[PDB]
PDB file of C-alpha atoms in Angstrom:
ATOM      1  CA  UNK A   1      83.962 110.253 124.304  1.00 12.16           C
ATOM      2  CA  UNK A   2      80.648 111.362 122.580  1.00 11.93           C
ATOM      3  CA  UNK A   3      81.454 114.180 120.647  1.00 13.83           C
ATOM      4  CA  UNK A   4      78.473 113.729 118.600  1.00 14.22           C
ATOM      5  CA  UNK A   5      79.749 115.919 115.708  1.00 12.80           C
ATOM      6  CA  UNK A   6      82.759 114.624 114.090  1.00 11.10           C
ATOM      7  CA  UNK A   7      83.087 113.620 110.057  1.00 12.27           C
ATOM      8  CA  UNK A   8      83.980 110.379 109.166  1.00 12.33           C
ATOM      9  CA  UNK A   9      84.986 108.733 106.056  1.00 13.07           C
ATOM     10  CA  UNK A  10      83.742 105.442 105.499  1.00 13.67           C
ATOM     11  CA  UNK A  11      86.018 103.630 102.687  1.00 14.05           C
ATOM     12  CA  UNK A  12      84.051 100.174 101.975  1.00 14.43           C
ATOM     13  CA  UNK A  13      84.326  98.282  98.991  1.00 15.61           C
ATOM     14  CA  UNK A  14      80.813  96.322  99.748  1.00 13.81           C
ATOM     15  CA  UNK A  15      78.073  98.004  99.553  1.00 12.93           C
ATOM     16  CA  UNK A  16      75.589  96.169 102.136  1.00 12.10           C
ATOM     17  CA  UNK A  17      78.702  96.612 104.595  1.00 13.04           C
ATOM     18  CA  UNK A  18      79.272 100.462 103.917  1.00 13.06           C
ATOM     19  CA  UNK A  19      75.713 101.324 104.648  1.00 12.84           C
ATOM     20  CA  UNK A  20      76.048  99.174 108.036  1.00 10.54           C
ATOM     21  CA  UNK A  21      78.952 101.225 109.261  1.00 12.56           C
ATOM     22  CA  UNK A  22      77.040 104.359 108.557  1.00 12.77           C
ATOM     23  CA  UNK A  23      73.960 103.174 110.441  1.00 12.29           C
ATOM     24  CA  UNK A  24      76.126 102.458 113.366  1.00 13.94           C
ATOM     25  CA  UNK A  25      77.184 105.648 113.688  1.00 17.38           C
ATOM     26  CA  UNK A  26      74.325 107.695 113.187  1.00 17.72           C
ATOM     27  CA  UNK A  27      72.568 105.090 115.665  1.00 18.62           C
ATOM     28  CA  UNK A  28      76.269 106.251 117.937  1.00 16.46           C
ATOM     29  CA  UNK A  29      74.968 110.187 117.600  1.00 16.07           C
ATOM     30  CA  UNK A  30      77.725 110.977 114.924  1.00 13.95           C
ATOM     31  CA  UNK A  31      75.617 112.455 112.416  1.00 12.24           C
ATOM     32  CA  UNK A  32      78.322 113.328 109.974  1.00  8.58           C
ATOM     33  CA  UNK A  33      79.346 110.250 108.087  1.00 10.00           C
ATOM     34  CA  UNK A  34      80.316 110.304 104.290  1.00 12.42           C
ATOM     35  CA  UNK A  35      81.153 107.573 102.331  1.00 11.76           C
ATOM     36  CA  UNK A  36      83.751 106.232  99.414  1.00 11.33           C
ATOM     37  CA  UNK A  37      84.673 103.081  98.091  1.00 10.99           C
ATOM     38  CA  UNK A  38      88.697 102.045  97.654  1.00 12.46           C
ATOM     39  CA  UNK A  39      91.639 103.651  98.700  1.00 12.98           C
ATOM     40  CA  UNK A  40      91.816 106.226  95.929  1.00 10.69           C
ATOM     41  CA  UNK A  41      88.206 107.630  95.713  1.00 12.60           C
ATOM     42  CA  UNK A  42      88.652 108.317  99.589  1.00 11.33           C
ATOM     43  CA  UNK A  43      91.975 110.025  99.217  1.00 13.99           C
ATOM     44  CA  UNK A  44      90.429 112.251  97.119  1.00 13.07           C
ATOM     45  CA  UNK A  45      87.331 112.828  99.417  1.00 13.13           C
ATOM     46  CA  UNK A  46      89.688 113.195 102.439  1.00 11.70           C
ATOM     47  CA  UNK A  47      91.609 115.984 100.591  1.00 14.11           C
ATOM     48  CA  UNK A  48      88.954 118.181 100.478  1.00 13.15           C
ATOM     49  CA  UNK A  49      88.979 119.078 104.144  1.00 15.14           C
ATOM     50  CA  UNK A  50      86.689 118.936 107.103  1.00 15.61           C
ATOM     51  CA  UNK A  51      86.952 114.867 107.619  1.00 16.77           C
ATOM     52  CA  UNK A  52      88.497 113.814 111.438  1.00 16.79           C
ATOM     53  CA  UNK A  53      88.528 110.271 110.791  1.00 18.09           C
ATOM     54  CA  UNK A  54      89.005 107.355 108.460  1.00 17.82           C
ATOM     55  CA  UNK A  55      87.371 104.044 108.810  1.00 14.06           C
ATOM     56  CA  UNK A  56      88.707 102.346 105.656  1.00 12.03           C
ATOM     57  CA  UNK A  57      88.015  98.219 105.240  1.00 10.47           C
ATOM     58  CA  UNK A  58      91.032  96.028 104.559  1.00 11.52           C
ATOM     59  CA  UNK A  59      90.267  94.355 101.385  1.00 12.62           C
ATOM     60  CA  UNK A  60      89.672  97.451  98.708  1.00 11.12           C
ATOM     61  CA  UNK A  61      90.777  97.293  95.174  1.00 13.87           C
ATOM     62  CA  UNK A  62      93.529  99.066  93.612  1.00  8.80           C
ATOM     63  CA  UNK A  63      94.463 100.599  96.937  1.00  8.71           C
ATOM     64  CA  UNK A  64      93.492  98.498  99.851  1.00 11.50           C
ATOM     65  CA  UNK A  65      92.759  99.373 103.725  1.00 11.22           C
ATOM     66  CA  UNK A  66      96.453  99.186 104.740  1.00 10.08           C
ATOM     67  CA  UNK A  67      97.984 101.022 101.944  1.00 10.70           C
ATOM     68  CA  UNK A  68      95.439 103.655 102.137  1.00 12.08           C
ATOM     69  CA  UNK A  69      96.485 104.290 105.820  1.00 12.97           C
ATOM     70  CA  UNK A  70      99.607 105.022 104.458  1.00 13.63           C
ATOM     71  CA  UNK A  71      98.731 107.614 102.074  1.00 16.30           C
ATOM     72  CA  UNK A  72      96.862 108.959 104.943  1.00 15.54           C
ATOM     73  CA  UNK A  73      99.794 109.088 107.945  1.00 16.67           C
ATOM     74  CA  UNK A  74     102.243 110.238 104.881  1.00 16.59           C
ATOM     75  CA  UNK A  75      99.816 112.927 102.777  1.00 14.38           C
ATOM     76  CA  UNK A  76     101.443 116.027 105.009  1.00 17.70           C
ATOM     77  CA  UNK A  77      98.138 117.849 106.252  1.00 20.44           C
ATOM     78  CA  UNK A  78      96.747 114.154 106.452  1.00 22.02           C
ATOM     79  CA  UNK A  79      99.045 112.771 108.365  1.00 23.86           C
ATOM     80  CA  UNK A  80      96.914 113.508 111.924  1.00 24.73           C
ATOM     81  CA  UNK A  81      93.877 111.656 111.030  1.00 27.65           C
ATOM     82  CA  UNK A  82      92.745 108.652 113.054  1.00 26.62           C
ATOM     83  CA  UNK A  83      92.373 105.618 111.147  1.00 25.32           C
ATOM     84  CA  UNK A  84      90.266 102.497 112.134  1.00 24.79           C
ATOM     85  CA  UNK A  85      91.399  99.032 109.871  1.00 25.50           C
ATOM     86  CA  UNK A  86      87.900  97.176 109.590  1.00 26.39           C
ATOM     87  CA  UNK A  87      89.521  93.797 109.026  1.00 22.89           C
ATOM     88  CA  UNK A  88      87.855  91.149 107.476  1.00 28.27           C
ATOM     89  CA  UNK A  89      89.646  88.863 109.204  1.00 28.06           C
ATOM     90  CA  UNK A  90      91.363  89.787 112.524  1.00 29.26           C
ATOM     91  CA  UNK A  91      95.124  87.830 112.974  1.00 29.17           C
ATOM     92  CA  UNK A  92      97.993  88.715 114.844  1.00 28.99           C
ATOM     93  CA  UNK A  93      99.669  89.656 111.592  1.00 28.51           C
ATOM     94  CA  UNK A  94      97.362  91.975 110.036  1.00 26.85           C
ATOM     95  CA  UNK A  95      97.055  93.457 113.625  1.00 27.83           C
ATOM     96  CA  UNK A  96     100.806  94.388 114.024  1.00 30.40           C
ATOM     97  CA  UNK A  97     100.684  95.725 110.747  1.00 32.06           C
ATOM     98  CA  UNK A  98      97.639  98.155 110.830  1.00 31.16           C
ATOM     99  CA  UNK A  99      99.620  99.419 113.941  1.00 29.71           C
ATOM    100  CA  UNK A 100     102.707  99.605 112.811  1.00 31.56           C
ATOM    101  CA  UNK A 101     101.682 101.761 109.464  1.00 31.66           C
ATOM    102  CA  UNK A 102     100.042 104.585 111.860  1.00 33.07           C
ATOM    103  CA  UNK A 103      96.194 102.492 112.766  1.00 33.46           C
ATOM    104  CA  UNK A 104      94.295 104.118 115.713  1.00 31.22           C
ATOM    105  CA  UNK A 105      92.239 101.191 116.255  1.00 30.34           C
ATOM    106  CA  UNK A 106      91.032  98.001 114.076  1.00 28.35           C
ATOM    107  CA  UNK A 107      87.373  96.339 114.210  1.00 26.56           C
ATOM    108  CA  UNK A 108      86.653  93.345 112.549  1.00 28.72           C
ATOM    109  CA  UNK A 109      83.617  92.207 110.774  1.00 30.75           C
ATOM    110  CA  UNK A 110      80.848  91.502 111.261  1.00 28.46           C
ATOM    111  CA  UNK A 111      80.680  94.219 114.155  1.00 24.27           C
ATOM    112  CA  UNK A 112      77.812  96.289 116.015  1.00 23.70           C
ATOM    113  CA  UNK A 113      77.205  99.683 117.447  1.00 24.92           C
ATOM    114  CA  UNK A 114      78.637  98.249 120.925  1.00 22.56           C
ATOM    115  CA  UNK A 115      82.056  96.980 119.150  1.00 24.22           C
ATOM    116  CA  UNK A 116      82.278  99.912 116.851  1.00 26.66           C
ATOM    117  CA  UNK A 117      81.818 102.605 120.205  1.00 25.48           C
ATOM    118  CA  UNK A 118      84.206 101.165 122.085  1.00 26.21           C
ATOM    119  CA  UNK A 119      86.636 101.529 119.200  1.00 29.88           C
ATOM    120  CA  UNK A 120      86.242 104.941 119.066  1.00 31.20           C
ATOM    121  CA  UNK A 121      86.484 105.385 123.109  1.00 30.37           C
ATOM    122  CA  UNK A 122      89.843 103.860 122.839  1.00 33.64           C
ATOM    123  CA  UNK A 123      90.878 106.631 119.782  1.00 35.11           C
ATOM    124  CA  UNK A 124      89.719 109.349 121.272  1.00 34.39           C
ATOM    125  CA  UNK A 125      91.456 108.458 124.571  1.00 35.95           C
ATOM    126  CA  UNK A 126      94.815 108.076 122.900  1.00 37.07           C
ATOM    127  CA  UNK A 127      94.681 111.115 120.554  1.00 33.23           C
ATOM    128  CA  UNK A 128      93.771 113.118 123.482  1.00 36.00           C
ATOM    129  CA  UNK A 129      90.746 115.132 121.354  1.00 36.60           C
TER     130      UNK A 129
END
């Protein structure tokens, strides 16, 4: 569902890729997207408040998409924020384990404002937002 006003936290290590993500979402009409880098410079961001989401890409350095879900699902007041895994490459075993360490959803990439949307859909629906 289009809730049009929800912040999201945008945790990619490329730059050409981060700015994609954003676009998508703006293009989506969720106009409050902020963006980080690695695991640890979103932690930090995400601590401050206000963020309802986490789309954090798989292969970050020093603290990488999976282990940053972690520190999300175990960071107490954190813990309840919806995470999507953008995979770089999508396999049954990296699938499981996005799921298994508290993942909402996982896109691969490359993907596009369709792929993305129905992502969310599926979050939102589950959550029960």
């Amino acid at each position: 569902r289009s809730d049009k006003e929800l912040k999201f936290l945008v945790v990619d290590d490329f730059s050409t890729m981060r700015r994609i993500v954003r676009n998508l979402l703006k293009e989506l009409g969720f106009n409050n997207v902020e963006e980080a880098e690695d695991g640890v410079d979103a932690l930090n961001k995400l601590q401050a408040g206000g963020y309802g989401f986490v789309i954090s890409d798989w292969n970050m350095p020093n603290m990488d998409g999976l282990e940053l879900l972690k520190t999300i699902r175990a960071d107490g007041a954190m813990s309840a924020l919806p995470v999507l895994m953008v995979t770089a490459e999508a396999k049954k075993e990296n699938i499981i384990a996005a799921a298994q360490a508290g993942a909402s959803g996982y896109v691969v990439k490359p993907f596009t404002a369709a792929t993305l949307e129905e992502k969310l859909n599926k979050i939102f629906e589950k959550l029960g937002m």
